[PDB]
Structure 1
Amino acid sequence: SLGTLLDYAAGVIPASQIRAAGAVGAIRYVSDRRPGGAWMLGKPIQLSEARDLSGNGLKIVSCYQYGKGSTADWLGGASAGVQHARRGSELHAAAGGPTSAPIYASIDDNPSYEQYKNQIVPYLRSWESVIGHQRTGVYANSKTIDWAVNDGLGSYFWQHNWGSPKGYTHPAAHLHQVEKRKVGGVGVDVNQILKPQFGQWA
């Protein structure tokens, strides 16, 4: 297998515990904590953590998510896409992330086709206007990935299963969230690597 990556926001996991869990790297946040989100110790990834991961031969992938539910980043369409892309680009660079690496903008939702057309499309076009089509990643279910692919929005795709049919993997996905688990007392999700160039920093 190509391997697995762990994604997490609640803390910083030492490189030796990621290795012990069998993962080859981590998907990490290039976003701020929303007010009251004191538990989000893993937001954003910092310079010392990134050097620790790379120093221990682990892969790093950038992902962006500030809001959630009724504060989902994409609700504000184009203006939100510009503010959030600028912030993610800033934090990716601040943690020593290279411009060759993309940033997975999060659609941590199960949107309707209407919500996709009226809000996610301008949200994602704005991510492309800021960091470019070649650096725009999309974290979303199989339907959203399908709609984005048809509109030519995003170059990297990370499938989540909220709204994805059970057992279906979109052929455009680089990464697939599969799974309820803690690594060193930090809640994590496990992600299968499906394509060899999946947005790793190096």
Structure 2
Amino acid sequence: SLGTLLDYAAGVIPASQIRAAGAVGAIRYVSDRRPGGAWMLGKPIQLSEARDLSGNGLKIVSCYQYGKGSTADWLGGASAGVQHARRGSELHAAAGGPTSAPIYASIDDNPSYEQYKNQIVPYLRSWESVIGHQRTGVYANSKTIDWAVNDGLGSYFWQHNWGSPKGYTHPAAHLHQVEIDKRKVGGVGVDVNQILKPQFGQWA
């Protein structure tokens, strides 16, 4: 690793506490709170929080996840992709996120090849059609990252371990989620991510 990035949905953490926890920045949501998700005070990142993080010399990265499970964003394929990508782009810009920075679209699942080809490919192609190939990031397991890389879908890859081989890091991944909810920072549960490549989608 080149440093740690934290991700969290339950609340907003003062940048001084992210820095005190040993992280060099955070991966933050450019998404709304779904029904049943009003507790996700960490969604979406606001301009004031982005200014706090950057102010303390911390890195910022954008990710998108609205639904989950039975309401996973990618289920609706192309039509779902344009609706979610537009909103993510709008929220990223509202928090002062530059258009030179990507947004990591979430595949918070362990899909089959059938789900990938029939639903995730049109979903991710819609993200590319809205914000561009160069701005399309993908949060997925290493199997899904490999399928996307092999298809030339997406430019940034953030590996999760649900459906990835034990102890494996995909050689194309920019970021790797290595720990889920095993830490609390400023009263908020956080996930830990390792930076693998020097250009990983940081705003600055």
Deviation larger for 109-118 or 34-43: 34-43
Could you list the runs of 5+ residues in structure 2 that have no partner in the other structure?
none
Cα distance in 2, alignment partners of residues 184 and 94 from structure 1: 25
Deviation at 1:36, TM superposition (A): 2.2
| Counterparts of 2:38 and 2:147, CA distance in 1 | 35
Q: Secondary structure at the match of 1:178?
A: strand
CA RMSD of aligned residues (A): 0.6
| CA deviation after TM superposition for structure 1 residue 119, in Å | 0.2
SS of equivalent residue, structure 2 residue 110: coil
Deviates more, 1:60-69 or 1:35-44: 35-44
TM-score by length of 2: 0.98
Cα deviation 1:99-140 (Å, max 9, x = unaligned): 000000000000000000000000000000000000000000
Give the SS at the match of 1:137. Answer: strand
Following the alignment from structure 1 to structure 2, what is the Cα–Cα distance between the partners of residues 106 and 36? Answer: 19
Unaligned runs of 5+ in 1: none
- The Cα offsets for residues 139-185 of structure 1, whole Å up to 9 and x where unpaired, read as 00000000000100000000000000001111000000000221111
SS at match of 2:42: coil
Deviation per CA, 1:9-63: give whole Å up to 9, x if none. Answer: 1100001110111000000000000012121001000000000000110000000
Q: Distance in 2 between matches of 1:33 and 1:101?
A: 22
SS at match of 1:176: strand
Q: Which whole-Å CA distance do the structure 2 matches of 1:24 and 1:169 have between them?
A: 20
Distance 2:196 2:36 in 1: 35
**Deviation of the 1:97 alpha carbon:** 0.3
Q: After TM superposition, what 4+ stretches of structure 1 lie above 3 angstroms from structure 2?
A: none
- How far apart, CA to CA, are the structure 2 residues paired with 1:99 and 1:184? 30
Find out whether 1:116 has 2:138 as its counterpart. Answer: no
Return the alpha-carbon distance in structure 1 between the equivalents of residues 38 and 184 of structure 2.
Answer: 18
Identity %: 100
TM-score of the aligned structures, taking structure 1 as reference length: 0.99
Shifted more, 180-189 versus 116-125: the winner is 180-189
